[PDB]
Design an enzyme around this catalytic site. Structure first.
Site, mmCIF file in Angstrom:
data_model
loop_
_atom_site.group_PDB
_atom_site.id
_atom_site.type_symbol
_atom_site.label_atom_id
_atom_site.label_comp_id
_atom_site.label_asym_id
_atom_site.label_seq_id
_atom_site.Cartn_x
_atom_site.Cartn_y
_atom_site.Cartn_z
ATOM 1 C CG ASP A 148 -2.049 1.514 1.352
ATOM 2 O OD1 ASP A 148 -2.619 1.622 0.415
ATOM 3 O OD2 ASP A 148 -1.727 2.388 2.423
ATOM 4 C CB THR B 79 -2.643 3.886 -2.158
ATOM 5 O OG1 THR B 79 -2.165 3.132 -1.713
ATOM 6 C CG2 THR B 79 -3.988 4.239 -1.263
ATOM 7 C CB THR B 80 0.611 2.345 -5.768
ATOM 8 O OG1 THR B 80 1.358 1.133 -4.244
ATOM 9 C CG2 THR B 80 1.777 1.718 -7.155
ATOM 10 C CG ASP C 42 -6.799 -1.123 0.440
ATOM 11 O OD1 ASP C 42 -6.886 -0.800 1.904
ATOM 12 O OD2 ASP C 42 -6.610 -0.305 -0.052
#
Lengths: 513, 513, 513
Positions: free
Chosen positions: A54, A87-88, A380
């Site tokens: 994450d 998120t990445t 997530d």
């Protein structure tokens, strides 16, 4: 003007450092991107070791020095809140945009033109997203299971992505109630080692890592009447300063017994409410714990405030300050409250709530670090499964979106012309980082897939394309159930474009030595 | 294996440092590129200050640390020898090729593919140069004047580029003789402050910064018979160890006078040859200088070996070791030898040679640093004017060549395909640095000229295009006399491509701490 | 026993360091291996930068610390002498053998068993090489051109491998005379920048980088009579101490002229021999240089002793100490001796020798570093082309040999049995490093080619297999002219196996701090 020793970057040096800051973050984090992405291993100043994929966790925990790197972190944080996953992805596309932006600065493109082109290209990219957005059922079992599944993949949790997808779409469906608004606060993520990942299961109520304060208390209570106290169950002491002044041998005995009498009466009042399951936010005196056990009332003390709230929402229990204030109307209902050993540890299962607004998901797995990753993974999954109910648009994965946006933004650039077009051309080309980095981590030929995917996408469409890293070739992402919420992609483009452009708008950095 | 402290770069780090090394050299030197290019100011370890725009001078004098930067220097050196000018150009295009190459390495293009594509694209670029090469008269006054002129421009010397062009094409035409081979050694570049640049002038013979050893010697000799001695004009001492042993008062007088008698006889032999102008590589004894003056022989001692050779070639004088060996057949001819004050300094003008194979160009200017730049400038003018006689092909400037090569190499890339095409595409795009950097130093809009020049070039041709930095717009370079020798461009592409590819072929750098 | 501070390795630590030493050398050098191999960049303590792919050059120049690494260097050195090329190959296979050997030590295989198995497996590998060795014509044009070609490839010189192959097979054929023995000393490798690689050419005689000592000397002499003097052409001074004692004014003149008379007579004797081309190992006095020029004798002084020997062998000239000793029978013959400018530099071409036993190869190229690599490249080409004439066996490349040896050594291991078999099994598997590392540098799938090549080799044979790194697939190396001398492979196995086993036989290293 500045203290001797203070360091400053300016013009192309401020831009050089700022680009390098975001570029390095993206360069290091992009190796996590995709189903075939890897993990980072962060070691704290105390020695605490965390393993994660994450982007947010990585950025929050690591020790960042560059101010521009500290700005990009916010992009990943807004992604965590809004969608949870991707998120990445948000960082990577931002870093590539900054990579292209530096070349444009080197190409003598005025800083105001670069930020103009990006603002323009991102405004079109937003329209293009709203144009390729695919309408799906906000609560459709099938599409929800696909959303849930795709989030799970690329993590250790993907081993049971079928079971986990079912769990999350059921949890979010329960707590959302009407159509609708989803609040992550309504789904607790509990983890306890033992069993495997497939054994992870949702409890339609509240699971807390607490135990019954007395061995004499019943181990299971049916048709449970839950009471929520915040005050401690001890001899209440007055707010105003007060002390007892004993001056008779009879009174020495009276007051000691009067203390026991009060606490006994307190318990009698708890019983009088009809309560038989009790959660106290504060402590419980040993004397009260006994009398509670003898009245057939099960109880747990020092209950986390967060647990007290999840209990209120699930059981419909009302949070009560004073014991005297307890009544039947303030009690919540649970079908069964039972104390069970999970991996040996005593935990309380408050389940079979009538109409729970809060549910608890218990994560199982072979090791602490397995259930650690899974607990992160499903957080997530809740995010993205919540997105689909509120915003009933989803889009195909495999980088097909950004390919659509690349083609149309190149056409857009042609309409723009002048020097501004180069900024739009670079913005469009930057969006190609997605299928390119997916392939690098997958070990696929970037050049081959970029020719075949782009051509095949443009002809066959968006609901019939994308790259499948699992077979290592262009496929049909949509048919294969490889879809993500629109929010993932639009929030990535939103936060990344504005923070990326903001970094590009900064021409001057003043930092301490 | 390596001593602790020794530093090593490997893989993408060896490539990172190597690209940065050549890229930094190019980044700093490219500001000299073009008619509107600027100058660098190099200060030595002793404090010696040199101001120059010549890439070679800059690279030779500056203190380079990076091994890869030391390799590129050789590219500039081979340019200096072969053509003289375009020294910066060769470095710039190499740096851009390395800039693009690093992106291709970042694009996951295998190191062998990058060097394959560049070798292929450079092989085509060589063919394309031979295909656009324009046949001109090897000794045509007009085209020679244009070659000479274009080299002169962008330097302080351009103020009299009309006079200087005429001077150089006359010098190179004189010394080349037949068609042909030009040797820079045949044209001496002398500089002496005073007058202006327009006053620079060619002397069809040899000008040396020497004076007549005696005030009694004639100041001007017509129909001069030049003798070239290498031995010193003093009492020759035997090779075998020998000493005189005087033991009679009569002999004390005899030997002292016998020394004077020898030296007098030596002078008598010089006169006997028919020589009346004398250049001695070594010293001349004061006694001999007098007797030389009385015989009407003018002489200069300690003559530079290089001057002795330029005298031989110009006058047709034969370099003679011993005075006794002098004869009329060993003497050279000059119409006039005259001692003149140039900026006050005594210099000897050996002019009006019958058929001089060596000539001397005297550079004038307002200051030492002016004649310093001009002396450098015309060295390059000789280079490029020599190129046109040997290789009777020239090409238009204004970056039109590289534009032709860019278009055809992009078409070439399409035929190549695979991943190899990207290397050829990047090679083609890299060639655009020329018109782009010319514009940056000129202060022109890079984007505008790149659209207008590329389109106008492709339609109108190569003999009808290029960018004119002097008006800041696309024009006709060929009509405007803006042409350079083919050698300039082909040698730039040759040395740059091989050394650039060589740098890209290096994957491992092992350097001391 | 040892001085405090002295470092020692023992047992598995001595083996650990020794394996790491050879393994690191091999790990760093193996990236040069093959046609698609890269270059290393070595920087000396003075700053001298050398770029090479030759394992020997790399190992000789680099600063090695590990004693075991210093032993492997000898393996590469014996390869250089015996065959020239395959220097990297010898190191790589040795490093892999050491890689496997360390695992066997970790596998609790007694040090005497490991070295027993390797000695046994290498003895069989030698037989297997002699069994697959392909008989070819010792002087066959075709196979010589293929040997020459394959050596050239993987270097910058491969651009003209067709011309260069022809050059080398002609040079070695000329100097070898009978069948036969080849001596590298008979072929001089000269390099001078200018032209391209295709312009490299062989001169059937001697090319030296010298010039005629006087400008008066003829620039070209036909039917040349070459004299080789070692003494200096000056006034010879007696061995016994002697000095002249002049005591008459007449004698002062006599002795000075007597010195000139001697030196004149010396020249008269040189002429008397019939010599008209003269090479003096030592200096020549300016006075003699003149008289030499007037007698029509061309001369060059300070001639390298090595050049004096190459002149003797080529022209058939006899090396003479004293001038007086010169005679017609001591003179050598050359068809033409001519002074030419090569890249401007004056060089003497002694060509068209009747029956030259020594020839000179002049290497051309765009830059010093190009002709530097080519000069190295063709040195190796001479080596391997010399191998084929002496030992008329060659073998196919593409790693097909080592594949044959791998299969048969695995079968050999089965016959050996016990624990000794594991050493033979590891030896056999280690030989696979060749096709594996070739593929890594080529960017090919190691696993795929290893399955396809091994199977295809075993069925189709050795004269119909191997890996072609140029198309990136199994092909027919033999049909494609991809062959190398048997000596390359057998000397690689020989030196590597013995030095590798020697390293494995060392159990104790005692080194200074």
């Amino acid at each position: 003007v500045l203290p001797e020793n203070m360091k400053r970057y300016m013009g192309r040096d401020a831009q050089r450092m700022n680009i390098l800051a975001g570029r390095i973050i993206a360069e290091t984090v992009r190796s996590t991107l995709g189903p075939k992405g890897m993990d980072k291993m962060l070691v704290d100043d105390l020695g605490d070791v965390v393993v994660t994929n994450d982007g947010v966790t990585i950025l929050r925990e690591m020790s960042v020095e560059h101010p521009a790197a500290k700005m990009l972190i916010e992009v990943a944080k807004t992604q965590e809140k809004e969608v949870g996953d991707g998120t990445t992805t948000a960082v990577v596309v931002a870093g590539e945009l900054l990579r292209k932006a530096e070349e444009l600065l080197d190409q003598n493109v005025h800083p105001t033109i670069v930020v103009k082109g990006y603002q323009a290209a991102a405004q079109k990219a937003q329209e293009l997203l709203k144009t390729i957005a695919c309408e799906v059922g906000a609560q459709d079992k099938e599409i929800l299971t696909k959303i849930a599944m795709t989030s799970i993949t690329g993590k250790g949790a993907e081993k049971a992505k079928e079971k986990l997808a079912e769990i999350i779409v059921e949890a979010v469906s329960a707590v959302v109630d009407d159509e609708g608004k989803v609040d992550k606060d309504l789904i607790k993520i509990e983890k306890k080692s033992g069993a495997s990942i497939d054994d992870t299961e949702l409890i339609k109520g509240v699971l807390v890592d607490k135990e019954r304060v007395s061995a004499q208390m019943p181990k299971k209570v049916t048709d449970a009447k839950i009471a929520l106290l915040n005050c401690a169950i001890e001899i209440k002491e007055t707010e105003t300063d007060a002390e007892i002044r004993i001056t008779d041998p009879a009174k020495l005995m009276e007051f000691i017994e009067q203390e026991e009498k009060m606490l006994k009466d307190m318990v009698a009042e708890i019983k009088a409410s009809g309560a038989n399951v009790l959660f106290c936010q504060k402590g419980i005196d040993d004397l009260a714990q006994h009398y509670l056990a003898k009245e057939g009332i099960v109880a747990a003390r020092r209950v986390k405030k967060s647990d007290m709230e999840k209990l209120a929402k699930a059981t419909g229990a009302n949070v009560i300050a004073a014991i005297a204030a307890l009544s039947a109307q303030d009690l919540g209902d649970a079908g069964l409250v039972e104390e069970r050993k999970i991996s040996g540890d005593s935990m309380i299962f408050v389940e079979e709530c009538k109409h729970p607004k809060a549910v608890t998901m218990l994560i199982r797995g072979t090791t602490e670090h397995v259930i650690e990753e899974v607990a992160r993974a499903v957080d997530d999954a809740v995010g993205v499964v919540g997105c689909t109910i509120e915003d009933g648009r989803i889009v195909s994965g495999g980088g097909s979106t950004e390919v659509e946006l690349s083609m149309k933004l190149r056409e857009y650039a042609e309409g723009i012309s002048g020097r501004e077009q180069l900024a739009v051309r670079a913005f469009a080309d930057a969006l190609e980082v997605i299928p390119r980095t997916l392939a690098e981590n997958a070990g696929l030929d970037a050049i081959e897939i970029l020719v075949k995917v782009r051509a095949a996408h443009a002809s066959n469409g968006n609901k019939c394309a994308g790259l499948n890293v699992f077979t290592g070739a262009v496929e049909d992402m949509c048919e294969n159930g490889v879809v993500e919420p629109l929010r993932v992609k639009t929030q990535a483009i939103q936060s990344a474009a504005e923070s990326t452009e903001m970094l590009l708008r900064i021409d001057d950095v003043i930092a301490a030595e």
